[model samples]
Target: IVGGYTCAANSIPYQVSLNSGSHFCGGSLINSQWVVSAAHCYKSRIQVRLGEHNIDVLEGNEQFINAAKIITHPNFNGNTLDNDIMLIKLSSPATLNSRVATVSLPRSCAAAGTECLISGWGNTKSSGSSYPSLLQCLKAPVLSDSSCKSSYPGQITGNMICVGFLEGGKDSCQGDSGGPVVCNGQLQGIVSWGYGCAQKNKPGVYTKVCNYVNWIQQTIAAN
Candidate 1:
């Protein structure tokens, strides 16, 4: 299933750090030139960590790509965490491989219960942040809009997607936002903001990728 339960042939994972310190969330590689991540990660001077495992500076002779540019969605509101999306332009394109790859975005955002996979370096159990040498993965079904509102009322927007288990113990956490929520192996949503990650009634919420095709393209052009 999913070839091996991981990011696709070109889907890359990244960690952003600031002041050579503060690290937050993760991101997905959509193409050679762009990395889609959370807007909050750009709150300060940041550096992108790729081709390696640690959020701390690279230790080995692996590979790396530094960001030459950072662009956040203008509509992004940290207060609500809506439109919490952005693109980081690597000073250069990354060399592709089984470990470092880019994922294909879906032609449609689709709907709830689409059956998707969520991957992250965040802590397996919520509480403290953790970065895994190999990314972690979990299966999630798309959550419906009305059902999402009932639990996370006023938090979800049309630009986002809901996923996770109502039973608990399975979900994204402190360091997982802006990462990909893949459906049918197609990049669909991005972890955004929400209440308890995998609480009994709450599912993980994320930015709907299909809703931002034009926004992503225009931003790329303008910058």
Candidate 2:
């Protein structure tokens, strides 16, 4: 995460790493058996790691579980990145503890300018690979739909929300996709896409979680 600070160990218990040998994306544990991530981060044989603070170290608190099932949103559009949400069912239920817990889903949509916290193991720089072993987090404010639309013209949609400084700096970069964008201790967005890592007038776009709450609940219930 560009322009962010290293997170304290166990500070973000719900934060998880989507890995295939190495960390490729971030996700949030919403329940013992379900995780929330971006649809674009999907891949075959993905594993989920919970209670992970640093990727390079094998902390005893970490729980490595295989993904039993992956459900990408039916309306997801790769070209425009619309409805970019996904759900992963854990092969086994996670053993929740102080270092491994679940994050609550949003009760309602967050308003514009709502300052939110975004965390991930993404690149620390806009250019080159500078991924940190420790998770990083930044405080970014949600931009209005109109403001977001202005930034990306035809790209921004109702299922997406923009967060971060328009002037550049702090943002969720590559490898941060599917990470959490939380507000009021609730899951509000999922890191989906961005123009360039923290570029001018190019805030990071996220899958608006509020818009998919019903779909998420129904999908989880049916399956």
Candidate 3:
């Protein structure tokens, strides 16, 4: 996360690394074998690693599992970036421990102005060539839809939430997509897309989890 520092290992046990032999995007383990992330993070031969705080180190608690299936939202849009969420089924169930567990999914939309935390290995800045070896986290406040709409103009939608300072200094930059936005100890959002990373007036956008709760439940059950 932008304007943030290294966080404790396993502090956010639900957090997982989606990889194609390397970190590509971040995700949350909603259950023993289900991981929720952004649709755009999908790629062939991807794997999921749980309880990982540092990408380069295994640290014992980490569980490496291949993705058994990937289910992208049927209406996911590439250009407009609407409904930008997805789910991945792990090849096997996770062995739960203190360093690895699931996050609670929100039953309703997180109220505006909720204080939230984002964690990821995304670049420190927009043009940065490499990402932090350890996970980074930032505290951000949810902004009102009106304020958010002003920044993105016509891009803001009910399915999205904005989080950042109006003056800009903190954000989730590139390589952060599909990460968790935890609010009030529950899973509230997923890193989706944005303009420049942490630019003035350009807050990061996330896929609002509550808006698609039914879809998530149905999909998980169907598959």
Positional deviation of residue 16's Cα in model 2 after best superposition, in angstroms: 0.5
In model 3, pairs of residues that clash are: none
Say which candidate scores most in TM-score. 2
Taking the tens digit of each residue's C-alpha lDDT, what string does model 1 give over 143-215? 8888777778777778777777766667786667777787876778787765655557767788888888888
TM-score of each: 0.83, 0.98, 0.97
Summarize candidate 2's per-residue lDDT along 1-223 as a digit string, tens digits. Answer: 9999999998999999999888999999999999999999988879999999988998789999999999999999989989999999999999999999999999999999999999999999987779898999899999999989998999888899999898898888998999999999989999999887988899999999999889999999999
Ten contiguous residues minimizing lDDT sum, candidate 3: 124-133
Error of 1 at 144 (Å): 0.8
Error of 3 at 186 (Å): 1.4
Candidate 3 residue spans exceeding 4 A from truth: none
lDDT of 3 by residue, 91-179 (tens): 99999889999998997788879999999999887555568989999999888899889999999888899987888778998889999
- State how far residue 139 of model 1 sits from its true place (Å): 1.1
Q: Candidates sorted by TM-score, descending order?
A: 2, 3, 1
Q: What's the lDDT for all of these models?
A: 0.68, 0.93, 0.89
> Which prediction has more favorable lDDT, 1 or 3?
3
- Runs in model 1 deviating more than 4 A are 1-23, 53-61, 127-133
Best-to-worst order by lDDT is 2, 3, 1
